[PDB]
Each structure stands twice: as structure tokens, then as C-alpha cells.
Amino acid sequence: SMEFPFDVDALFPERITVLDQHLRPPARRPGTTTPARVDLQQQIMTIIDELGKASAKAQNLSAPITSASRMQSNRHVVYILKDSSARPAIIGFIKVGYKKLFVLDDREAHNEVEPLCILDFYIHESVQRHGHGRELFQYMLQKERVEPHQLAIDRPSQKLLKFLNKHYNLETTVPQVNNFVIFEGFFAHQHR
Amino acid sequence: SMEFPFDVDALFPERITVLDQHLRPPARRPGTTTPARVDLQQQIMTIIDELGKASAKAQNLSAPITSASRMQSNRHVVYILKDSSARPAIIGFIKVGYKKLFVLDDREAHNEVEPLCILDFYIHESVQRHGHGRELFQYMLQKERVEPHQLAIDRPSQKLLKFLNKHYNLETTVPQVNNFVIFEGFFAHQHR
Ligand SMILES: CC(=O)SCCNC(=O)CCNC(=O)[C@H](O)C(C)(C)COP(=O)(O)OP(=O)(O)OC[C@H]1O[C@@H](n2cnc3c(N)ncnc32)[C@H](O)[C@@H]1OP(=O)(O)O
Ligand SMILES: CC(=O)SCCNC(=O)CCNC(=O)[C@H](O)C(C)(C)COP(=O)(O)OP(=O)(O)OC[C@H]1O[C@@H](n2cnc3c(N)ncnc32)[C@H](O)[C@@H]1OP(=O)(O)O
Ligand code: NA
Ligand code: NA
Numbered sequence: 001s002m003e004f005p006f007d008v009d010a011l012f013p014e015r016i017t018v019l020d021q022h023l024r025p026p027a028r029r030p031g032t033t034t035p036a037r038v039d040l041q042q043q044i045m046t047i048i049d050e051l052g053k054a055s056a057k058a059q060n061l062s063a064p065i066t067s068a069s070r071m072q073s074n075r076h077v078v079y080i081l082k083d084s085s086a087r088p089a090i091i092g093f094i095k096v097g098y099k100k101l102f103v104l105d106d107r108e109a110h111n112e113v114e115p116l117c118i119l120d121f122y123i124h125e126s127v128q129r130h131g132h133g134r135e136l137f138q139y140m141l142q143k144e145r146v147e148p149h150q151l152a153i154d155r156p157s158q159k160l161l162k163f164l165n166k167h168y169n170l171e172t173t174v175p176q177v178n179n180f181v182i183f184e185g186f187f188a189h190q191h192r
Numbered sequence: 193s194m195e196f197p198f199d200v201d202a203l204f205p206e207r208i209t210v211l212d213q214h215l216r217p218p219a220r221r222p223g224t225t226t227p228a229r230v231d232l233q234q235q236i237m238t239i240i241d242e243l244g245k246a247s248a249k250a251q252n253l254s255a256p257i258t259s260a261s262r263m264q265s266n267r268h269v270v271y272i273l274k275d276s277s278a279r280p281a282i283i284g285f286i287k288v289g290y291k292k293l294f295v296l297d298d299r300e301a302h303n304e305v306e307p308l309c310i311l312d313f314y315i316h317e318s319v320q321r322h323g324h325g326r327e328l329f330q331y332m333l334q335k336e337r338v339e340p341h342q343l344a345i346d347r348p349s350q351k352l353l354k355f356l357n358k359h360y361n362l363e364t365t366v367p368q369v370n371n372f373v374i375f376e377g378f379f380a381h382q383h384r
Binding site: 056057059060061062125126127128129157158159162 | 248249251252254317318319320321349350351354
């Protein structure tokens with residue numbers, strides 16, 4: 001299980017914490033002496049760096065695709081799952097963002113579009129296949145106000161393909177040259 | 193945790209079970225009514241098939257690299273780790289075999305050789321990073337009568353590269369065109 005040299009429960013009061021390019025420390029309930037926000041932001045940056053590294057090891061990548069730096073220079077949104085009732089905290093994350101994609105269609109019509117993309121997604125190995133990925137995915141869909149078949153996925157893994165099929169009945173449609181994956185229903189003339 | 197529709201503790205009495213192309217059922221202590229060996233062998237084949245599929249999902253491969261069929265047609269040896277004291281069994285495996293490799297050296301001498309190769313290796317996600325991989329690797333080295341720096345690795349993952357460096361001080365040497373990895377000391381003129 002993952003761990004940091006600072007109080008993650010204080011930093012992240014909610015079970016799922018949303019962060020964007022501002023990397024803004026969550027507000028806390030009044031009363032406690034809160035560290036300086038600059039220092040809280042460095043804690044968040046270290047968490048994102050380490051989560052990105054862990055995801056890269058899980059995915060057999062030579063370099064992370066998620067980092068604090070890349071958060072600050074992009075318009076990515078990360079959702080970080082803690083357990084507040086852990087004994088004796090951070091479980092994983094999902095990172096999304098809108099991307100311009102020059103997408104190939106199936107009747108062969110081809111074009112541009114900017115869907116919300118699933119960019120990185122990781123649940124710690126020890127608690128994979130327990131339902132944490134689904135909780136995190138569900139929360140992200142609700143906040144982004146997106147439906148599953150509207151997504152594009154950047155280079156999904158085998159585990160993720162199975163996940164998407166199980167939870168959302170997502171079936172792949174036309175392969176795409178750009179290595180993003182889209183599903184039946186992505187195009188308006190498709191069903192589901 | 194992994195699970196099968198038959199008694200793995202009866203099938204595999206030892207914590208680490210070695211199997212080769214014969215896929216021979218382990219002998220048991222006298223007394224129990226043992227199923228027919230053909231049926232025990234089918235149980236073993238199903239275990240190897242499922243372990244290979246799990247390893248392929250872990251590794252983001254489109255197809256397994258380990259299967260009962262491929263065991264029977266190759267000269268591969270698999271070491272399967274159970275826990276006999278599990279509550280309320282199979283943890284993972286390592287697969288090895290000798291392979292002819294047309295290896296590129298570092299003073300640029302180049303040639304043929306047939307080292308023992310690490311071909312597949314998987315510990316269930318739930319108990320990765322607990323020391324199970326090391327126990328299994330240690331047992332395999334002792335049985336094969338091989339030293340770590342004598343090995344070649346078929347397409348090691350990032351996790352495995354870190355593992356080998358931690359436990360055995362293995363540092364990569366000349367990259368190889370064949371996608372196998374070898375370490376300093378593989379060649380007789382190298383140290384360690
Ligand atoms: C764009 C990208 O981010 S690609 C990279 C995606 N991330 C990774 O592949 C990293 C490693 N894997 C993980 O981090 C996680 O397994 C995730 C994020 C893919 C899924 O989250 P989880 O918490 O494991 O999933 P959750 O428990 O909610 O759902 C389980 C389902 O996911 C799929 N799944 C999860 N683990 C596996 C596995 N080892 N083998 C096959 N399918 C799996 C299956 O559909 C499974 O349902 P099943 O058990 O009925 O077969
Ligand atoms: C030729 C091939 O088989 S390539 C494919 C290898 N298999 C895989 O990559 C599948 C997924 N991973 C696994 O199955 C396992 O993690 C294995 C087989 C690689 C290693 O077995 P484990 O039981 O996890 O290793 P064990 O606990 O004995 O040793 C731990 C060490 O392995 C490495 N390691 C294990 N998990 C990770 C990880 N998530 N991130 C980075 N390094 C890791 C580290 O060196 C670690 O030591 P550390 O915790 O001090 O950093
Ligand atoms: Na993983
Ligand atoms: Na894994």
C-alpha cells in the first residue's frame with residue numbers, strides 16, 4: 001500500500017479529490033491550523049508525481065505519462081481516490097482531458113473532433129479487482145457530465161478494455177491510427 | 193485471489209511445484225484415493241492456461257506467452273507457487289527454458305549461445321511486492337543450478353528490471369537486437 005511522509009487525510013478530506021492545472025489544495029472544515037497553501041501544493045505535486053510513476057510501472061512504461069509538471073502545463077483533470085477509514089490512504093487515480101483527435105470513422109467518413117479522453121488510470125495492485133476502479137470511473141463520469149460511449153481512450157490496456165466492456169458494455173469500433181480507442185456509439189449514427 | 197474448481201492443495205502438495213513438458217502430476221503421500229492421473233494432468237493444464245492468461249493481462253499482452261499446449265511443445269519448465277496455509281492457493285509462477293540466442297557483445301564480439309532464459313513470471317496483483325517473486329526466483333535458481341548473471345530475460349518489464357537490480361545487483365549490459373536482456377557479468381571478461 002502507498003504512503004507519503006505527510007498527512008494525506010488532512011490534505012484530502014474527501015474520498016475522491018478532483019484537481020486541475022491549478023493544483024489547488026482542498027478547503028478544510030474550519031478550526032485546524034492548516035499548513036501554508038504553497039506547502040500543501042508541494043505535497044499534492046509529490047503525490048501526483050508518485051502516482052504517475054506507479055502507474056507507469058504498472059503499465060510497463062519507460063517514463064510516466066502523469067506528473068505534477070505535466071498537470072501544470074496541460075489541461076488535465078485528475079481524480080484521486082483515498083480510503084478515509086484505512087487501517088492503520090491513496091488507492092489510485094484517473095486522469096482525463098479533452099484532446100483534438102483526427103478520427104477515422106466507419107462508413108469511412110473521417111474528421112476532427114475533441115472528446116473527453118481517458119489518459120491515465122491506476123489502482124494499486126494490492127486492491128485491484130475490488131471495485132475501486134469502477135467507483136472512481138463513476139465519479140469522474142458524473143463530474144465531467146459525460147457518457148461512456150462519448151469517450152476516447154489513449155492506448156487502453158487489456159485490463160482496461162475488459163473493465164470498460166464489463167461495466168459499460170463498451171465494444172470497440174473502428175481502430176484508429178492515432179492509437180486512441182473509441183466504442184460503438186461514439187458516432188451519432190451508431191447504436192449504444 | 194486465484195481459484196480453481198478442484199483441490200489445488202491435493203494436486204500440488206509442495207509450496208513450489210516444478211513441471212516440465214511431461215506435465216507430470218506430483219506424487220502424494222500414500223493413503224488418499226488419488227484421481228486418475230489423466231484427470232490430474234487436465235487440472236494442471238487448466239492451471240497453466242489460466243496462469244498464462246493472468247500473466248498476459250498483467251503484462252498488457254494480447255495473447256498469453258504461457259499455456260499448457262506451449263508447455264507440451266517446448267522445453268519449458270514452470271515453477272508454480274501455492275500457499276498451503278492460505279485462509280480460508282496459487283500465487284504465481286515463473287517459466288524458464290534454454291534458448292539459442294544470436295547475442296551481440298560489447299567489445300562488439302558477437303555469436304551464439306544458449307543460456308537459461310526467464311520467459312514468463314507473474315505474482316498475483318493482490319500480493320505483489322510482498323517477497324513472493326524473490327522466493328520463487330531463488331528456488332528456480334537453486335533447481336536450475338544457474339547464477340543470476342548467467343541468465344537472459346525475454347522482454348523484461350519495468351517491474352522485473354527493478355526486481356533483478358534489487359535482489360541480484362543486476363545491471364543491464366549491451367542492448368540486444370533480439371529483445372532479450374542480459375546483464376554485466378554475462379560474458380566471461382565482465383565482472384559481476
Ligand atoms: C488509458 C489508460 O489509463 S490505460 C492503463 C489502465 N491501467 C492499467 O492497466 C494499470 C493496471 N490496472 C489497474 O490499475 C486497474 O486494474 C484498472 C484501473 C484497469 C481497473 O480498476 P480495478 O479497480 O482493477 O477494476 P474494478 O475492480 O473496478 O473492475 C474489475 C473489472 O476490471 C477488469 N479487470 C481488472 N483487473 C483485471 C485483470 N487482472 N484481468 C482482467 N481483467 C481485469 C475486469 O473487467 C474486471 O471484472 P471481472 O473481475 O469480473 O473480470
Ligand atoms: C520475462 C518476464 O516475465 S517480463 C514480465 C514480468 N512480470 C510482470 O511484470 C508482471 C507483473 N509483476 C509481477 O508479477 C511481479 O511484480 C514480479 C514477478 C515482476 C516480481 O515479483 P514480486 O513478488 O512483486 O517481487 P518481490 O516482492 O519479490 O520483490 C519486490 C521488488 O520487485 C520490484 N517491484 C515489484 N513491484 C514493483 C512495482 N510496482 N514498481 C516497481 N518495482 C516493483 C522492486 O524491485 C521491488 O522492491 P522494492 O519494493 O524495494 O522497490
Ligand atoms: Na498492475
Ligand atoms: Na500487474
